[PDB]
């Protein structure tokens, strides 16, 4: 009977309202600075070259904006990079199909590839989960000879994982923009702003396991939310119980 979705709905809406105000607070500042300096770089280009004119420069921008729809891409390996992005639902967004048959294929290629790749990621998950189980069975015998012990183990998970899958692969995949790269990619958000050939056979496997790593990390963070959702549910429960108490005694 109890819906309980509406409350989670408003939390998400409110999370998004807070997120919005925080993003425009952080980004609309540089947006002005950058775009005041873009108006400068036209008027510096127009003044420094009387050869090109006002009416003719927009004809260049249009044909650049037309070239945005296109840009060797689609080579033997770049289309397989593209194909990986589709089934992983990463989809960096840099290259997309333009032919009507490439879209109809991409629709079928996704509807079949996403579940298929899901089974691969699931197997790599269980594969990697027992490998981690091997590493903690030894560690949970050396200094254990137990309810709070389970926290020390989860500290070493986030520690050893954010080394292999966040810190280290900065080389494989500045200091911040690497962690930013890693998180946006492995959360499958789609890392658009940035993106030897024998490189991608090993890199795409660090992706395959890093995807399994954040898949677990995201699920733990979700499990911490079920916990904190109950603590906040019971806390409000008490403070309503005593305020009702209080309102009753004060009236007498």
Ligand X SMILES: CCCCCCCCCCCCCCCC
Binding site for ligand PIO (CB under 6 A): 4, 7-8, 11, 112, 226, 228-230, 232-233, 236
Tokens of 237: 């429960």
Among 20, 108, 136, 189, binds ligand CCCCCCCC (CB under 6 A): 108
Using a CB cutoff of 8 Å and minimum separation of 24, what contacts does 92-96 make?
Answer: 92/190, 92/191, 92/192, 92/195, 93/190, 93/192, 94/192, 94/195
Please give the structure tokens belonging to residue 118: 């899901």
Asked whether residue 189 is marked as a ligand-binding residue, the answer is yes
Q: Is 229 in the site for ligand CCCCCCCC (CB under 6 A)?
A: yes
* Cα–Cα dist 95/93, whole Å: 6
Instruction: Give, as ranges, the residues between 8 and 67 that touch ligand CCCCC (CB under 6 A).
Output: 11, 14-15, 18
Which of 195, 228, 241, 243 lies at the binding interface for ligand CCCCCCCC (CB under 6 A)? Answer: 228
Determine whether the annotation assigns residue 99 to a binding site: no
74/239 with CB nearer a second copy: 74
Candidates 132, 190, 200, 215; binder of K ion (CB under 5 A) is: 190
User: Which of a second copy, ligand CCCCCCCC, ligand CCCCC, none lies near 232, with the C-beta cut-off 5 to 8 A by kind?
Assistant: ligand CCCCCCCC
Q: What share of the chain is helix, strand, coil (3-state, %, to 5)?
A: 80, 0, 20
Residues 205 and 36: their CA atoms lie apart, in Å, by 43
Q: Give me 192's structure tokens.
A: 């658009």
Write out the residues near ligand X by the rule CB under 6 A.
Answer: 104, 107-108, 176, 179
């Amino acid at each position: 009977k109890w819906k309980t979705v509406s409350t989670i709905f408003l939390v998400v809406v409110l999370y998004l309202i807070i997120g919005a105000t925080v993003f425009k607070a952080l980004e609309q500042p540089q947006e002005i600075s950058q775009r005041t300096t873009i108006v400068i770089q036209r008027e510096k280009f127009l003044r420094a070259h009387p050869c090109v004119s006002d009416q003719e420069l927009d004809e260049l921008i249009q044909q650049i904006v037309a070239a945005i729809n296109a840009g060797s891409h689609w080579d033997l390996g770049s289309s397989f990079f593209f194909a990986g992005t589709v089934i992983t639902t990463i989809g960096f967004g840099n290259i997309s199909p333009r032919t009507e048959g490439g879209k109809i294929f991409c629709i079928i290629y996704a509807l079949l590839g996403i579940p298929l790749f899901g089974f691969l990621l699931a197997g790599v998950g269980d594969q990697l989960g027992t490998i981690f189980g091997k590493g903690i069975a030894k560690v949970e015998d050396t200094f254990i000879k137990q309810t709070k012990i389970r926290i020390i183990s989860t500290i070493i998970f986030i520690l050893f994982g954010c080394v292999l899958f966040v810190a280290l692969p900065a080389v494989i995949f500045s200091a911040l923009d690497a962690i930013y790269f890693v998180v946006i990619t492995l959360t499958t958000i789609g890392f658009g702003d940035y993106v030897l050939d024998f490189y991608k056979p090993v890199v795409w496997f660090w992706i395959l396991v890093g995807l399994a790593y954040f898949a677990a990390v995201l699920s733990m963070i979700g499990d911490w939310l079920r916990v904190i959702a109950k603590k906040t549910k019971e806390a409000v429960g008490e403070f309503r119980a005593h305020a009702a108490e209080w309102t009753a005694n004060v009236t007498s």
